[PDB]
Amino acid sequence: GATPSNVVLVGKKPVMNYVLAALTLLNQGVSEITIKARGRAISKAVDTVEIVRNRALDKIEVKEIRIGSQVVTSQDGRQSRVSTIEIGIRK
Amino acid sequence: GATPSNVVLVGKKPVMNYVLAALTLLNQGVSEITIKARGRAISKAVDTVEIVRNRALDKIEVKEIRIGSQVVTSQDGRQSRVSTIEIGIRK
């Protein structure tokens, strides 16, 4: 539990912010990193990985990809679906 | 080579257009389908898969996911990167 959290949550910010977060983790010695996103940010999660694959040149490999759905519960109890992606990369 | 082409290329159209294309393939007896997209359409490819997994109910499973990059060559020879996703699903 003491090693730096290896998750990069990709949201609304410019893609290069998440690229910087992944590169910072690589420089801490964290060799396995998980990029997670939901909804429209799924494309930005893939961009983050692909940009990092170039900026780390070191080989970075995609280890695992999972897609799925999560439930969004509204203030009045209605429930709707959002897509998710999780991408594991490894140095 | 005579069976219906099992690829759904997801682009700029409303997501339900690609949902319908995948369901049409399922109705044709095609049990393995590949959803492909690039750039900002990557999010819509994932949504396509997740929406179909509900509308098929038949259990549709994600078989393989691959992400990568392709090169876009401009009219004057410059080259730039675009992200890709490919998602194989199976009934």
From Swiss-Prot, chains A, B:
Question: After translation, how is this protein modified?
Answer: Acetylated. Acetylation at Lys-12 decreases DNA-binding affinity.
N6-acetyllysine PTM sites in chain numbering: 12
**What does the record give under GO molecular function?**
double-stranded DNA binding; RNA binding
Q: Name one GO biological process term.
A: chromosome condensation
Cross-referenced InterPro entries, in alphabetical order?
Alba-like_dom_sf, DNA/RNA-bd_Alba, DNA/RNA-bd_Alba-like
Specify where it is mainly localized: cytoplasm
One GO term of the cellular component aspect?
cytoplasm
Keywords, alphabetical? Acetylation, Chromosome, Cytoplasm, DNA condensation, DNA-binding
Keyword Flavoprotein attached: no
For the keyword Coiled coil, the answer is: no
**Disulfide bonding pattern of the chain:** none
| Places the protein is found | Cytoplasm; Chromosome
Biological role stated in the UniProt entry = Binds double-stranded DNA tightly but without sequence specificity. Involved in DNA compaction.
Concerning its family, UniProt says: Belongs to the histone-like Alba family.
The entry's protein name is DNA/RNA-binding protein Alba
Q: Which organism is it from?
A: Sulfolobus acidocaldarius (strain ATCC 33909 / DSM 639 / JCM 8929 / NBRC 15157 / NCIMB 11770)
